[PDB]
Symmetry: D2
Subunit: 274 residues, 4 copies
């Protein structure tokens, strides 16, 4: 299986290939004066099974680039194409919240099911979006890797989910840290943060409001060292400054989405799903 680098996951694809002990295929990527995408599989392809690793921080670019790469691979003999989109865009919702709307992941799943034979993604917000796919839809979990990153720097912490929705992430991390866990309902449903270290974990941190809010409160409830972790560090605008001011000790994310805090890698997580 050759590893094909998408323009948005060049380091992750490299790390994965290294783990798979596979030669990393040279993929040419550039923009015409138009700004149209130009892709090109430079190395010669003998193998007939490729794995495209291209996350979607720049959503529409990732979609088109992937479409073009698949065409290029098929036109070169590749029989099976697996797409690894660490961060999958347009997959936040399950349905319409208003008449006249579209179900974006539904429309894209149709295209994916036609151009690739398998799709892998890390920590999707909605697990049910797979119902729209007619090809294998595999999802890995990076929460364990985040937990392993902090057990090293927190003293008998309480693992909190920013809301009930993220309770599972807290539980997962909770098990790895041998700590208690709960979720803010505003305050934790059961536990008390007075004089305790806290590990707030969620799948995404965009705006930072939900997070910054939890932190300010927890600090008021006498929380000690607080670390906020997320799988997809979207961190829009001044999100990071917002969290730091609220008083977090540190914010950490993974490399599914490029940020100033993408410290943890999902390479191993991806390798296991291959």
């Amino acid at each position: 299986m050759i590893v094909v680098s998408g323009s948005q996951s060049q380091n992750l694809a490299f790390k994965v290939a290294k783990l798979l002990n596979t030669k990393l295929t040279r993929v040419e990527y550039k923009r015409f004066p138009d700004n149209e995408i130009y892709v090109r599989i430079v190395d010669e392809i003998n193998d007939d099974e490729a794995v495209i690793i291209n996350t979607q921080k720049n959503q529409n670019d990732a979609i088109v680039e992937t479409i073009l790469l698949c065409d290029a691979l098929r036109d070169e003999g590749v029989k099976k194409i697996t797409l690894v989109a660490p961060y999958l865009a347009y997959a936040r919702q399950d349905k319409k919240f208003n008449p006249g709307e579209a179900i974006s992941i539904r429309a894209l799943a149709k295209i994916y099911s036609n151009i690739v034979d398998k799709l892998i993604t890390i920590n999707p917000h909605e697990t049910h979006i797979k119902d729209f796919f007619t090809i294998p839809f595999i999802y890995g979990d990076a929460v364990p890797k985040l937990a392993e990153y902090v057990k090293d720097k927190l003293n008998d912490p309480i693992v909190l989910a920013p809301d009930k929705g993220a309770l599972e992430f807290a539980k997962t991390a909770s098990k790895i840290l041998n700590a208690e866990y709960d979720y803010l309902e505003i305050a934790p449903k059961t536990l008390d943060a007075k004089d305790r270290d806290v590990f707030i974990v969620d799948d995404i941190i965009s705006t930072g409001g939900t997070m910054a809010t939890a932190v300010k409160l927890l600090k008021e409830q006498g929380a000690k060292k607080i670390i906020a972790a997320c799988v997809h560090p979207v961190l829009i605008g001044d999100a990071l400054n917002k969290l730091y001011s609220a008083g977090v000790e540190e914010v950490v994310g993974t490399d599914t989405y490029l940020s100033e805090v993408s410290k943890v890698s999902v390479a191993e997580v991806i390798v296991d799903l291959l």
Copy 2:
């Protein structure tokens, strides 16, 4: 038939709807903090035949927005969707110019043939790209409209094609202006521009080199008033300044692609293909 506005052809869709004497459907368009596209058919849809008019100056955005709109329309009863993409992106080439490459229009034609029942575009560069579509692929010609715009301001002009490839545009315009026509082979193959007005016409002007070059020469051959027209005024970077300096009297384009010179409309041209 309801007219559905794409975010990139709001004025053109309006002009078309007006000609079709149809009520223009209100379509909500915005970006999430993510910068992901959000679309929404606000007005209620009774009719089951819609026409999406969305050009592709911002290529990847147009492709994704179109995909989302089709999903939204289908999920609302629409049985037939016709896509009008005045300027169609990724359709410049017919095949590969290097191994390992993709045929972009081939890959996209597959998606188009699946989400829409008919595709209309104005002055494609390559007429053969239609072979990749499994749905009706209609193309209109806006050259006649450009010709009609200049017959008013040129004195017994010579219609020139920047190269042999664009000879047909020159011939088309030539007929409407009752003028002679030729093409640069560098100099015109047969005609002579000494003391004559010139109408240079092509389908696209990106960089401006081909054009600027023709103009400087023609000026040297004693050409008088020179007007340069194109259907898709891509005019990248300093393209316009380049042409003006070379000495053109005026540059004019259509509204298939937004530019500072998109003076001619293709609304009527589109209405006739519906």
Copy 3:
């Protein structure tokens, strides 16, 4: 006086130069792979008075490009540089609306007063921003040109200002059309739109809310043909579709800011201020 084209006003600079019957200076503009701006006065400069015409739709790019061009001109002998920024960015506000804020036009006026000897702009939102400049700050009015564009297509119209703030624009246009004028206070303060054509005029239309609102109401008060005009057609997102749906007959703007409806030119207006 040589005319120096900014990358954002290539057509306007051309039209102005033509009116001034001056040879248009060839100005090289491109982006490094970095995406850093590269400018270059190609033609040789003998004259020592230049006029830079560069509007600021892409705000920060226009500011830096202008700074670089001034340096390039000075380093070439130019003694007097006049900057024409049809649309001037960061000049919407007069002061702070919250502690800790900045007065953006104040900070930029300082830079302008240092790199250019004169600044010209069309229809500023706040006339008092000139108090921050220590160089001549001239502003032209394009409303008369908008009025002249519609008198041709409205039957004894009522000229309305979207709000009291824009009453002067309505009055100006009103005089040219020999029509009555008023302003919405929601409804017109004095006049009545029952069975009447309406010319809504303002300096800017961004979001379209203020406008779309006025149109829907006016339609309800039995307004007939409604035309909405603005000097700076910012028209963000689905603004145009919003207005068309509300029922406007047409939206028209000038070429100070590129839009799908920048029909009226401010070239003559600029030429008179030179």
Copy 4:
């Protein structure tokens, strides 16, 4: 001294403030629908000495945001403003390489000398650009930090400069690693890479050509494990894939410019220059 976060160095500013054991000032940053920048010092400012830490990956945005922040700080009592621009844009060249050009750093130095009292940057390409400033121009070196990152994973390596220009970086790292050093002149001027680990170090890696070239050759000369480090990991387009394919063991950069490999921090380096 309060630390003021720029929107582009939120993590670095945090790390620096933490080292300076200073409370990190909350700075509001957002975009108007226009896309114009909005900044706001939220926390109250008592101290009258601030340090702005805002790198310039997005060049023109950083320049304008900095200008606005300075205005906001002055208007709030701050007497001394020090600007830390880890990566300083438009400072690559010392002079003109063609008539009609500008000296970008010269034009910007004028603005900097007027809005800030001190400017700090990390590893400038051209040390002479300081001659254009009329305020203190301090530059720190992050090469030592890169060297410290690799001594851990290279076996008695040869430190190479991609060209003569970068010989000093190689020498600096060379000292810290107690290794020999040289520079490609194509091949090393003196040393021989046969059966040896290699540490290629430069200040910047944009396109990757210079680098990828050196790596392919070195591999041919029988080089073993090769690590490529740079201070500013601009890594445009498919730069990383290019290097990985050439055969580098790893590419590492600092956090002056956000990339998928910004592993080393310059926080300490900055703290020492304060």
